[PDB]
Amino acid sequence: PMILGFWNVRGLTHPIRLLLEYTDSSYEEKRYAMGDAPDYDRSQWLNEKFKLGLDFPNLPYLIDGSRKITQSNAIMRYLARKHHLCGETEEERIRADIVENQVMDNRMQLIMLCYNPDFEKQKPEFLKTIPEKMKLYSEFLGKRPWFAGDKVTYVDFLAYDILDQYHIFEPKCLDAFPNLKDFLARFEGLKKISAYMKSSRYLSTPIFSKLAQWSNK
Amino acid sequence: PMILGFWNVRGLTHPIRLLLEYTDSSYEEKRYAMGDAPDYDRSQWLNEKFKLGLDFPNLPYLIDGSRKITQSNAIMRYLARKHHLCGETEEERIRADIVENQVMDNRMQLIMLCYNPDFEKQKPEFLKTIPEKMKLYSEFLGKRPWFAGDKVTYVDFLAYDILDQYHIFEPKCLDAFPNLKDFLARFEGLKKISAYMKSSRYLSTPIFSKLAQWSNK
Ligand SMILES: N[C@@H](CCC(=O)N[C@@H](CS[C@@H]1c2ccccc2-c2ccccc2[C@H]1O)C(=O)NCC(=O)O)C(=O)O
Ligand SMILES: N[C@@H](CCC(=O)N[C@@H](CS[C@@H]1c2ccccc2-c2ccccc2[C@H]1O)C(=O)NCC(=O)O)C(=O)O
């Protein structure tokens, strides 16, 4: 089958695992473990980093026969093309493009905070910024059922993940945004998703590696 | 015409300024200035950030008729689709997907180094990771004229920019990789490119804002 490699955390790989399940892909996973502080040993990965034939070795990676991919967005697009889960008109394409990239930004902002030695003192400032990020997603989605238009596309998988993470981080963050709360429930409502969430494979937390200041164990 | 908005620095917009020229696009730019220390006023932008009707306001932005786009990668792909500068086959799409995302990683690595107060401190070590970064681009490219394959595609504008930047940072970083040096000369040799580099509109430095520790002026 296809091999997905990543750390044994949700990290930035949730969308992929979700999309592999949604599409009924036949895949196996390799979940590398990181050791504990203070050294946070990475040897399980490092032992094979340069042995897998990857052009730009990194995690996550996807091996699909002779096809070897790295970079999460490139893996997401590869599986989207295979399964017809890309936008179909220019307008959906542009919406898809923007959201892909915007998710990445919002993901990096969370990371910078959670790996900041000053997490606890930085936290208050970060919180204040949340309602503005969510408003932008709320107004972008509006009354559409999904981010790109009328049909699920790979970008709903990225959007779900990041909205779900901010929601774990600040549970009351979606209170003001009905259509967001509704998008979460709709997504989780998809038959394949629903069934995966009850599976042995489901990995929602920790979100971050042991190095982080939040959701690290 | 189209409007490109961004700071008056090369930043991460080089690839879009290059592509507008290559495609002979009719564009004007709004180059925002940041005031100087100690408050580095961003008011010129901030006064209109939410008045442009962008979905997720940011810089760069492109306005193209009724289309309004943010996210540099999204602007790049929009222009690529508009001018047929995308990969044509599955192998070329995958190669483009990976490179697009890898360039962003290598970009963030540089930015992250350049915005650290401990810059001078960190240079040395950063300087040793370079050989390995270049080697990967070099092997990936191999004997091909362009990164996706047989034809110039938008990712070549991305690859050009980051190899250019690394080369400004470490003038000798490419002596070991002649195919990369050849790629820089072939890109710069493109007709519309050459003319742009001698024009008043060309902005190859500074790279970073006044905030930065290198290429900040
Ligand atoms: N742009 C690329 C990003 C590739 C990359 O940096 N990968 C990390 C793991 S991803 C990492 C992470 C590691 C552990 C736990 C969490 C994270 C995480 C979470 C959210 C967002 C970013 C992160 C990141 O901090 C990794 O360990 N790489 C193998 C290595 O360096 O040898 C992508 O989109 O695919
Ligand atoms: N992922 C997005 C990124 C959008 C974004 O963060 N833009 C920065 C300017 S880009 C910035 C920069 C500002 C000044 C000088 C240099 C940089 C820079 C250079 C290289 C790489 C990244 C950077 C960045 O540090 C900004 O000032 N935004 C307006 C605002 O937030 O209100 C994209 O790909 O387009």
Ligand closest to CA A114: 1
Angle at alpha carbon of residue B134, lines to B132 and B137, rounded to 5°: 115
Crossing angle for the helix pair A90-114 and B72-82, to the nearest 10 degrees: 160
Contact A103, A133 (CB under 8 A): no
CA distance A199 to chain B (A): 31
Q: Please indicate whether, in this complex, the C-beta atoms of A55 and B98 are within 8 angstroms of each other.
A: yes
Method: X-ray
Which pair of structure tokens corresponds to residue A14?
């949730």
CA gyration radius for chain B? 17
Numbered ranges of CATH 1.20.1050.10 in chain A: 86-190
- Could you give the CA distance from residue A119 to residue B203 in angstroms, rounded to a whole number? 38
The string over A84-96, giving b where at least 16 C-beta atoms fall within 10 Å of a residue's C-beta and e elsewhere, is: ebbbeeeebbbbb
Numbered ranges of CATH 3.40.30.10 in chain A: 1-85+191-217
Label the pairing between strands B27-32 and B2-7: parallel
User: Which region holds residue B87: left if phi is over 0, alpha if psi is between -120 and 50, else beta?
Assistant: beta
Q: Please indicate whether, in this complex, the C-beta atoms of A97 and B77 are within 8 angstroms of each other.
A: yes
Laid out side by side, the sheet with A61-64 consists of: A27-32, A2-7, A61-64, A67-70
Angle at alpha carbon of residue A23, lines to A19 and A24, rounded to 5°: 115
CA distance B173 to chain A (A): 18
The string over B9-44, giving b where at least 16 C-beta atoms fall within 10 Å of a residue's C-beta and e elsewhere, is: bbbbbbbbbbbbbbbebebebbebebeeeeeeebee
Which pair of structure tokens corresponds to residue A18?
């979700």
As a dihedral over the C-alpha atoms of residue A201, residue A205, residue A208, residue A214, rounded to 10 degrees, the angle is -170
Pocket probe for ligand 1: among A59, A108, A111, the residue whose CB has the most ligand atoms within 8 Å is A59
Ligand closest to CA A5: 1
Q: Resolution in angstroms for this experimental structure?
A: 1.9
A1-85+191-217: which CATH number, 3.30.450.40, 3.40.50.970, 3.40.640.10, 3.40.30.10?
A: 3.40.30.10
Please give the class, per CATH, of domain B86-190: mainly alpha
Which pair of structure tokens corresponds to residue B128?
């040793």
Q: Is A56 exposed, middle or buried (0-12, 13-18, 19+ CB in 10 A)?
A: buried
Residue B72 near ligand 2, beta carbon < 6 Å: yes
**Ligand 2 centroid to residue B192 C-alpha, Å:** 26
Q: Please indicate whether, in this complex, the C-beta atoms of B101 and A74 are within 8 angstroms of each other.
A: yes
